[PDB]
Amino acid sequence: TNLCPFGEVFNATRFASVYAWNRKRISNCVADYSVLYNSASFSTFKCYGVSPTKLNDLCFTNVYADSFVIRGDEVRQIAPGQTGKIADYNYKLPDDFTGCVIAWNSNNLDSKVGGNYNYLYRLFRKSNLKPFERDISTEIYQAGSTPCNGVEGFNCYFPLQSYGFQPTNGVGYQPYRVVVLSFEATVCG
């Protein structure tokens, strides 16, 4: 009868880069999903599968909490059936997703003058990611027919790019912290 440690997911001092997205397993606790919803501090709280007011009256065996940072424009890609740089090459949700997606603007925390380059994303990949796949390789991307041999150059690109989060960015280009809750019984409300 312990409380689920959502505070250490939502209030972590740093978030992961989206390509190396962080996953926390939630088990053996009671979760108040209605304090998360009724916080009124989130810009996105879209649930796929069941309403948040109603899943407080529900139990699951495990809950996964995935967290990362992306651009505000890319939050729309954190949904079933989406395409784009994030959904294709960084974090992919399945078509039959049955959880909740939560996001909020973190320009005050993840941007700095001159640019915060901590947060990375994958720009090049040979194919799309499977749902809930995490690709953390730094192999040089071969964009032509000549092998790269682990050094950059023409047709040989480092696959990861840094966001350049500056506070003067337009909102769509500002950093947003994202939490994805997957539901698959040791977790109740």
Epitope: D88, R125, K126, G144, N169, V171, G172, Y173
Partner: antibody, heavy 118, light 107 residues
């Protein structure tokens, strides 16, 4: 050696169809972001379409539902299928490899001309 | 995002210092590219990431800026530099292009 050679442009009537080809040498079409960019007579540049290395596609709004971008790995060739052409679509069309933030559009085709007129 | 190039055209002499500016409507950090286009020819990439010189491009070209104000500078104009120049937003499909700047011969 590194080049993009385009063809398929020509005269066509409103509502008609046309297919542009972009045959590549020195870059691998199916491994890259490949873009089409057009330039109407006396005007600037306008992006038309992109196909990702992973197969995802995107289009400018004035072109959605009429244009289809695709590629052939065996021929290392990029295609743009243009349906329901309008007079506005009259332009020189360029294919280009797109590196986005990691470079820009660094390899360009020579361009092919599309005239839509009754 | 909209990109506003200034001026629409400018006249200069060989050896002059030429400055072309691009103003973004919101703030795009360093996601900016500069292209050169001559009549009848395809665009040619000069600079990406606002200030990185494309390989093979002469060093008299340089880019500066981050945020909303960007500049293309030709330190000593050469005869083959008379052409039209375009800025382009990077990292955004529907990418925005500037309206272009024509560099013409002064007399």
């Amino acid at each position: 050696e590194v080049q993009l050679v385009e063809s398929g442009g020509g005269l066509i009537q409103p509502g008609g169809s046309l297919r542009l080809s972009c045959a590549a040498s020195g870059i691998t079409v199916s491994s890259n972001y490949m873009s089409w960019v057009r330039q109407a007579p006396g005007k600037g540049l306008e992006w038309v379409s992109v196909i990702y290395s992973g197969g995802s596609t995107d289009y400018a709004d004035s072109v959605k539902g009429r244009f289809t971008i695709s590629r052939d790995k065996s021929k290392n060739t990029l295609y743009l299928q243009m349906n329901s052409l309008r007079a506005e679509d009259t332009a020189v069309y360029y294919c280009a490899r797109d590196l986005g933030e990691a470079g820009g559009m660094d390899v360009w085709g020579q361009g092919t001309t599309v005239t839509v007129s009754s | 995002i909209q990109l506003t190039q200034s001026p629409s055209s400018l006249s200069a002499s060989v050896g002059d210092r030429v400055t072309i500016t691009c103003r973004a409507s919101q703030g795009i950090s360093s996601y900016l590219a500069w292209y050169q286009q001559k009549p009848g020819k395809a665009p040619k990439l000069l600079i990406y990431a606002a200030s990185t010189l494309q390989s093979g491009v002469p060093s008299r070209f340089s880019g500066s800026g981050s945020g909303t104000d960007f500049t293309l500078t030709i330190s000593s104009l050469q005869p083959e530099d008379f052409a039209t120049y375009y800025c382009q937003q990077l990292n955004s499909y529907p990418p925005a292009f500037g309206g272009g700047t024509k560099v013409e011969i002064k007399r």
